[PDB]
Amino acid sequence: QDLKTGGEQGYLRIATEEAFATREIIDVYLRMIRDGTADKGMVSLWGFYAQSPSERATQILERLLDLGERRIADMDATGIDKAILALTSPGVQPLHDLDEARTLATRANDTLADACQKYPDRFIGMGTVAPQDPEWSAREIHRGARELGFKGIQINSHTQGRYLDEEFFDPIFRALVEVDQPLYIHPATSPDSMIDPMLEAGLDGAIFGFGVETGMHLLRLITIGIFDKYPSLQIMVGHMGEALPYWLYRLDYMHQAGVRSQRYERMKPLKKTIEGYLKSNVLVTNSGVAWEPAIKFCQQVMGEDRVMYAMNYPYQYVADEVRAMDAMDMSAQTKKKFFQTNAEKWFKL
Amino acid sequence: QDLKTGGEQGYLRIATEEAFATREIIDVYLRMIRDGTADKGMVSLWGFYAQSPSERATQILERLLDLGERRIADMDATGIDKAILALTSPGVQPLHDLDEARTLATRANDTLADACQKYPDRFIGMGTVAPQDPEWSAREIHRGARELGFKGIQINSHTQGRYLDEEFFDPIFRALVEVDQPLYIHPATSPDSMIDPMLEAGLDGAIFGFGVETGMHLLRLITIGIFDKYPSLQIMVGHMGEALPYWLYRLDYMHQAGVRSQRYERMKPLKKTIEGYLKSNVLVTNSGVAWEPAIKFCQQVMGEDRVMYAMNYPYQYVADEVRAMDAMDMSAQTKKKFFQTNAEKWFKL
Ligand SMILES: COc1cc(C(=O)O)cc([N+](=O)[O-])c1O
Ligand SMILES: COc1cc(C(=O)O)cc([N+](=O)[O-])c1O
Ligand SMILES: [Cl-]
Ligand SMILES: [Cl-]
Numbered sequence: 071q072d073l074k075t076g077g078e079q080g081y082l083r084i085a086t087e088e089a090f091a092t093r094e095i096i097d098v099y100l101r102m103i104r105d106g107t108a109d110k111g112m113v114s115l116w117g118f119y120a121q122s123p124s125e126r127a128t129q130i131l132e133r134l135l136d137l138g139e140r141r142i143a144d145m146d147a148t149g150i151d152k153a154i155l156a157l158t159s160p161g162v163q164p165l166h167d168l169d170e171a172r173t174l175a176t177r178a179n180d181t182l183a184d185a186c187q188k189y190p191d192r193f194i195g196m197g198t199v200a201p202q203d204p205e206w207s208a209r210e211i212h213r214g215a216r217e218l219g220f221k222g223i224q225i226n227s228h229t230q231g232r233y234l235d236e237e238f239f240d241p242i243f244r245a246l247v248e249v250d251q252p253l254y255i256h257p258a259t260s261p262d263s264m265i266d267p268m269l270e271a272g273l274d275g276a277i278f279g280f281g282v283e284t285g286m287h288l289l290r291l292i293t294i295g296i297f298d299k300y301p302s303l304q305i306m307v308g309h310m311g312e313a314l315p316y317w318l319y320r321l322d323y324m325h326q327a328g329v330r331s332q333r334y335e336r337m338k339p340l341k342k343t344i345e346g347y348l349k350s351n352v353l354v355t356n357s358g359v360a361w362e363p364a365i366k367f368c369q370q371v372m373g374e375d376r377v378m379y380a381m382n383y384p385y386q387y388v389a390d391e392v393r394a395m396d397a398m399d400m401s402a403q404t405k406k407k408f409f410q411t412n413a414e415k416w417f418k419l
Numbered sequence: 420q421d422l423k424t425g426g427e428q429g430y431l432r433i434a435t436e437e438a439f440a441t442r443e444i445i446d447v448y449l450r451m452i453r454d455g456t457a458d459k460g461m462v463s464l465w466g467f468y469a470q471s472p473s474e475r476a477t478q479i480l481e482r483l484l485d486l487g488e489r490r491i492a493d494m495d496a497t498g499i500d501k502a503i504l505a506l507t508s509p510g511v512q513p514l515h516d517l518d519e520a521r522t523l524a525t526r527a528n529d530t531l532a533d534a535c536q537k538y539p540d541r542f543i544g545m546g547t548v549a550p551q552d553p554e555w556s557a558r559e560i561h562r563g564a565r566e567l568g569f570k571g572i573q574i575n576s577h578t579q580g581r582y583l584d585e586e587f588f589d590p591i592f593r594a595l596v597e598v599d600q601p602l603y604i605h606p607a608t609s610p611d612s613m614i615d616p617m618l619e620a621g622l623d624g625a626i627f628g629f630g631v632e633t634g635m636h637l638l639r640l641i642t643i644g645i646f647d648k649y650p651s652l653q654i655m656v657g658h659m660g661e662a663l664p665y666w667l668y669r670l671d672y673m674h675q676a677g678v679r680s681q682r683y684e685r686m687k688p689l690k691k692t693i694e695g696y697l698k699s700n701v702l703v704t705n706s707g708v709a710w711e712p713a714i715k716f717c718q719q720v721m722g723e724d725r726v727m728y729a730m731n732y733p734y735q736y737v738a739d740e741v742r743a744m745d746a747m748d749m750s751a752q753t754k755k756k757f758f759q760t761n762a763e764k765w766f767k768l
Contacts (some may be wrong), residue, residue: 093433124680191610233616245720267577271584271639272683277673278638281666282631289627307604315663317630323735324626331473332623361668366717386672400732 071393073149079396082151084264084413087256087308087380092143092178096120098165108267109230111259112164114274127342134158137185142192148392150381152191154417155182156224157198160258163229171200179210183218194419195220196254201229201239207295208245219416222251222306227287227315234287235294243300245347252304252353252416256299257284257312275381276358276385285312288352293325297340297351305414308357308380310364315354315371320346333359348372353416355380360391365408374404378412422498422741430755433762434494434739436605436657436706436729437502439732440483441527445469445508447514458579459615461513463623467766473737482733483507486534487497491541497741501540503766506547509607515579520549524559532567543768544569544601550578550588564598565693570766571595573603576636580610583636584643584685592649600665601702601765604640605659606633616653625707625734637701639685642674646700647690653765657706659713664703664720667694688736697721701732702765704729709740711747714757723753727761 075083096216099116102108109117109404119127133144137155145153157178162171175198186193194271197214199207214220225234246253254273257280259265268274268282288307297303307314314321322344328337342350347374354364357380371376379395398405413419424432448465451457457465468476473544482493485503494502507528514520526547535542546558563569572595575581583591585606594600605756606629608614617623617631646652656663663670672694677686691699698721705714706729718726728744730736747754762768 118435118680118682122680122682127663143667186500186522187581228616231616233620235620261616263615264613267580267610268635270584270685271635271642272677272686273635273638273642275673275677277670277677278635278666281669282635286617286620286622286627286631289622293511293620293622299588310665312666313630313662316659316662316716317627319713320630320707321626323707324624327475328621328626331467331475333467333471337621358669358672363716363719364668367575367665367712368714405541 071397073147073389073392075146075149075151076231077151082400083149083381083392083409084152084154085150085381085383086154086355086378087254088153088155088414089134089385090137090155090385091158091180092174092181093135095157095162095174095178096373098170098174099225102164107166109164109262109275110269111261112160115259117213130384133387136311137181138188142189144383144387146193148381148387148389152194153383154194154196154221154413156254156256157182157195159196159226159256161226162200163202163226163258166199168202170203172206175200175210179214179218183220186219194417197223199223199225199242201225201234201242203239204239208228208241211242211245211249211251211392215251221419222254225253226256227258228261231263233290233336235278235290235296243296243303247256247300247302250302252306254306255284255288256308259282259283281309281312284309288312288314289321292344293337293340295340297337297347304351304353306353306355306416308382310356310359310368311352311372313352315368318348318371329397349376353378354378360388360394363392365398374407375412377408377410378416420498422738424495424498424500426500428745429751430758432498432502432728432758433501434499434730434732435503435704435727435762435766436603437504437732438483438507438734439486439504439531440507441530442484444511444523444527445716447523448518451513456515458513458611459618460610460623461509463618464608465572479733486530486542491538493736494541497736497738501543502732503543503545503570503762504546504766505533505573505603505605507530508605510547510575512551512575512578512607514551517549517552520551521555528559528563528567528616532569535568545571545573546627548572548574548591550574550583550591553590559591560591560594560598560600562671562700565598570768571600571603572604575605576607577610579611582639583643584639592645592652596649596651599651601655603655604633604636605657607634608632630661632657633658634663637661637663638701641688641693641696644687644689646696646760647727651701655702655765657704658730659705659708659717660703660721661699664697664717667720668698698725699733701725702727706731707735709737709743711743714747718753723756724758724761727765728758
């Protein structure tokens with residue numbers, strides 16, 4: 071079963087959640103780990119990826135750092151026509167020195183824009199920001215859209231234990247709506263306030279902690295009414311929607327029960343059900359979930375227009391996953407939406 | 420009038436996750452709230468249910484405390500033939516005074532056993548323990564199985580921030596294997612080490628935090644190798660498996676990645692995949708999830724023999740949910756397993 075670029079099978083493969091790193095940023099993580107300012111998540115996640123002697127961690131690091139011929143080759147070998155690229159979690163979000171965070175985010179964005187320019191038919195950019203400074207972040211969203219050819223931004227969930235439902239972060243949403251671009255909420259390790267029981271069992275990372283953190287964050291945003299405030303805003307999440315589609319019946323039941331019993335001041339009546347917001351304002355990718363039953367479930371819940379293919383390169387670079395997706399028992403029209411035309415629509419490619 | 424007991428529709432309706440309270444234990448929660456020894460989760464959960472004048476809270480309290488004709492009338496009105504009853508979360512697990520914990524658990528168990536004796540064709544008991552004292556808990560498991568006629572025990576997830584994968588709790592598992600009975604791991608609020616970001620958003624309870632806490636607890640039991648140490652052990656969870664069936668592909672992928680890379684001391688090779696353990700040692704109810712797509716997904720993933728009906732009375736007592744379950748697009752044979760015969764098998768009714 072051959073994996074070829076060019077769309078001869080009836081669609082292009084557009085991979086919508088693909089990571090890169092910059093040497094300068096990984097070096098800051100290593101410095102933070104050495105000087106004791108790294109949070110427990112950073113020590114766990116980047117203490118491993120930047121310091122494990124294994125062939126595997128080593129290959130992920132090398133692949134993350136390449137934005138040229140090797141990445142193109144890996145894409146060609148798996149039949150990936152286009153990749154939507156974003157700076158790997160947690161970006162500059164954990165950094166205490168804001169001059170450094172803004173400088174390195176600017177440089178990461180510059181580097182990405184240069185790579186997309188060099189490979190305009192293969193690489194598509196999502197910008198990185200420094201939510202610590204929402205006003206600068208808003209300017210960088212405009213710069214991404216205006217000068218850099220970027221299609222949106224990726225935020226790596228929380229910023230130092232603070233979440234985007236806080237009014238403090240509103241300039242970011244204001245800017246996304248001004249440029250009419252989607253937000254990808256990508257996972258991160260939980261903050262120190264929440265991580266301990268997961269970390270002790272080995273569950274703080276992609277196995278579990280990622281989905282908890284990210285699902286929590288998107289749920290918080292839905293329930294604060296972000297989509298009533300910003301009805302045009304689209305938020306994309308990976309990993310088959312961080313379980314929210316499967317939890318949907320219970321989410322809506324318990325959300326309505328809480329509101330009606332006036333349990334939490336924070337939880338106020340919304341204009342739509344959570345189901346309603348999933349169908350109008352949330353977009354999902356299958357990153358890390360090359361599994362047909364889950365994909366089909368999620369298509370049924372959210373609509374086939376709102377579920378997209380993502381590989382999660384280089385953390386999950388598996389040719390047999392692409393093969394299993396190419397071979398799903400799904401109509402030609404639906405498969406082409408999933409691999410290609412959904413992404414083309416929602417990222418305005 | 421259209422929901423009837425007696426099984427004329429082809430099956431009995433056995434509700435496998437039904438709650439009661441004792442006044443004296445609720446009073447201890449109130450005391451702990453007043454004296455500042457309650458954890459944040461108890462304050463949130465029981466500060467609401469024991470004190471709110473809302474319709475939802477008052478009905479829950481009233482129904483939780485009844486183990487006689489009012490409960491029977493509520494069951495008759497919704498066609499529920501039998502209910503498997505357990506002391507409502509968090510039971511005695513948060514109590515600092517062990518003598519008090521052991522005493523109140525004993526009394527809750529004797530109270531339940533009295534009710535089952537009085538209505539033996541309607542009420543089935545799961546016992547409650549005090550995992551703070553694992554050895555006492557082992558003896559109470561003996562007593563439940565051999566003297567009180569109970570079919571298993573329910574543990575309300577964590578005990579004072581500690582999880583059952585610790586060797587400290589091993590006497591509980593030894594005892595369950597000895598009497599050959601299932602453990603139901605029911606939710607609780609997250610411990611103080613994890614709860615803050617959920618609590619601040621109104622998400623610490625059943626809407627989200629419950630699933631995070633219970634899924635993490637089952638997952639860490641699986642990854643520590645509990646089912647290799649005790650291959651006969653069956654662990655039941657509600658809420659459609661706390662999303663673990665939906666996450667399965669990601670869980671197995673990332674579990675294997677973590678094992679092979681030696682990332683974590685508590686994540687070593689297991690004899691089966693996580694999927695393997697779901698199909699041989701884990702059992703699921705649909706408590707809180709009266710939703711055909713999720714039920715069918717779960718049946719597909721774990722096997723239709725391993726998925727059972729639960730109402731979650733009184734937290735979710737909805738005649739229209741029972742009607743929706745009766746109307747599902749399933750064979751008569753599948754429906755009978757789901758409502759009746761799986762429970763008869765797994766609880767040894
Ligand atoms: C640093 O970012 C990631 C790390 C990993 C991992 O540790 O396996 C997974 C994904 N992911 O999306 O699942 C990441 O993007
Ligand atoms: C204190 O026990 C529970 C509370 C809630 C609730 O607050 O709605 C729901 C369930 N449940 O399992 O969904 C409970 O068992
Ligand atoms: Cl606690
Ligand atoms: Cl292996």
